[PDB]
Write a protein that binds this ligand. Structure first.
Ligand SMILES: Nc1ncnc2c1ncn2[C@H]1C[C@H](O)[C@@H](COP(=O)(O)OP(=O)(O)OP(=O)(O)O)O1
Ligand SMILES: Nc1ncnc2c1ncn2[C@H]1C[C@H](O)[C@@H](COP(=O)(O)OP(=O)(O)OP(=O)(O)O)O1
Ligand SMILES: [Mg+2]
Lengths: 225, 205
């Protein structure tokens, strides 16, 4: 969770908070970190599922079949059937699944409060919930048909190449700051005294700061395109 | 001696080409301007970078046109004042103040004719190709002086080569007057030694 250059700050934070020492330095999780993790888990699992459903890669039959126990004792069939567009029905199901998962996660967290506070809890809150087969099926379907689409693979390869050239250009500029081209690259990419490890981590952070469109434009205009 | 700097002979000649035996309608230095105007390297200058590559911002041709005018104005004043100082030039040989202006204008017009594209970065790229590129493979097969040129490519040398490039059927290239060639040369020295002093004429070759 942290680099070597931020060890002291996290040590101070841990010492103040009171996290239990486990070992190399290592501590125990904050329970609020468990809550954040569960919230984040429920969101991507449900939002990614519904996004795959509207974009044309997954049929509404899977939407209704895979989401039955989640929305079981919370749905009104008359209102569900009164809707016409698929988007409203999917939102309606998404709304009900999020509520029930929130309630179940709160109950699960309150079940294991002593174990979590003592640092002996070794799992998450979602994996200790009754509804797991449906979640696993949704995740597997998303992996099969959303993450393996041709456009996703093409964009990943393009990003793969763009980051590779950007990193090699930054490293070549950093190495020997003597030639005119290197000075030009330094003035363009990083126009704003440290050791080798900090220099590299700052380069990585600067690369991670750029957005998709900015990185694409920079890659095109460094190549004259 | 000023009678020798204002030479009118061209490459491949055998006569004397005296000043007093020429028609004032078309002077020899004006023929140089006419030849440079109609040349292809001069016409290619309209697509080359001054400061901002690739509007109302100047290119390499307008720049030359402006210099061709200012230098002509400077040279005409200078020639008028020399003739005022030296009276034998206009009494025995027959020189006029327009000669200096024409020579300087002709030299000014083609002073930036051999520069590589993209302005300042092109020469640096060409030089770095033979130093930190594949061209370093050719280092062992060339002498010190030849390798020096290649790793320190210059626009002045390229311009002189373009102006004096011999081809089958066209010996001497544009065949300009020797006075124009002398006025065009800014660094009358070879590539080695590299910067032997702080003089203005030995910074480059
Ligand atoms: N308890 C919750 N806390 C936070 N967000 C929630 C909760 N339940 C659902 N959400 C999400 C998904 C919902 O579509 C959206 C708005 O919630 P909300 O309007 O209360 O649900 P709903 O559409 O099921 O209404 P209703 O109470 O009529 O069943 O926020
Ligand atoms: N570092 C630079 N980056 C970009 N343009 C530059 C730079 N230095 C000069 N210029 C531009 C300004 C002028 O419009 C243009 C023409 O100048 P130039 O003739 O190349 O210079 P110079 O007088 O130093 O050359 P030289 O001594 O080789 O004849 O170059
Ligand atoms: Mg997240």
């Amino acid at each position: 969770g942290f680099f070597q250059s931020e060890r002291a700050l996290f040590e101070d934070v841990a010492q103040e908070l009171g996290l239990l020492k486990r070992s190399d330095v290592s501590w125990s999780r904050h329970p609020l970190a468990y809550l954040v993790e569960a919230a984040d888990d429920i969101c991507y699992t449900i939002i990614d599922f519904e996004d795959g459903i509207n974009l044309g890669l997954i049929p509404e039959e899977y939407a209704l079949e895979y989401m039955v126990k989640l929305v079981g004792q919370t749905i009104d069939r008359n209102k569900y059937n009164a809707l016409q567009e698929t988007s409203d029905r999917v939102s309606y199901l998404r709304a009900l699944a999020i509520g029930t998962l929130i309630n179940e996660s709160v109950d699960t967290f309150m079940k294991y409060e002593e174990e979590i506070l003592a640092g002996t809890f070794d799992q998450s809150l979602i994996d200790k919930s009754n509804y797991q087969a449906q979640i696993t099926d949704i995740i597997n379907l998303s992996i099969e048909r959303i993450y393996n689409s041709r456009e996703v693979i093409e964009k990943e390869i393009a990003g793969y190449e763009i980051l590779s050239t950007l990193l090699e250009a930054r490293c070549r500029a950093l190495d020997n700051n003597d030639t005119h081209y290197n000075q030009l690259i330094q003035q363009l990419l990083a126009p704003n005294e440290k050791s080798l490890y900090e220099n590299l981590i700052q380069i990585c952070a600067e690369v991670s700061t750029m957005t998709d469109g900015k990185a694409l434009r920079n890659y095109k205009k460094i190549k004259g395109l | 001696n000023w009678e020798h700097l204002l030479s009118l002979k061209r490459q491949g000649d055998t006569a004397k080409r005296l000043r007093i035996e020429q028609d004032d309608t078309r002077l020899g230095f004006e023929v140089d301007y006419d030849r440079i105007i109609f040349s292809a390297p001069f016409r290619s200058l309209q697509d080359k970078t001054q400061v901002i590559p690739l509007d109302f911002v100047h290119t390499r041709l307008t720049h030359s046109l402006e210099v061709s005018v200012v230098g002509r104005s400077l040279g005409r004043m200078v020639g008028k004042k020399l003739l005022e100082k030296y009276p034998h030039l206009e009494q025995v040989y027959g020189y006029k103040f327009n000669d200096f202006g024409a020579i300087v204008a002709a030299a000014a017009l083609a002073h930036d004719i051999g520069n590589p594209p993209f302005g300042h970065s092109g020469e640096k790229a060409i030089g770095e190709f033979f130093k930190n590129g594949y061209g370093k493979r050719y280092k062992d097969s060339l002498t010190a002086k030849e390798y020096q040129d290649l790793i320190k490519f210059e626009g002045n040398a390229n311009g002189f080569k373009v102006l004096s490039q011999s081809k089958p059927g066209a010996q001497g290239g544009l065949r300009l007057s020797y006075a124009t060639l002398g006025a065009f040369m800014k660094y009358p020295k070879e590539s080695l030694p590299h910067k032997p002093s702080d003089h203005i004429a030995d910074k480059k070759y």
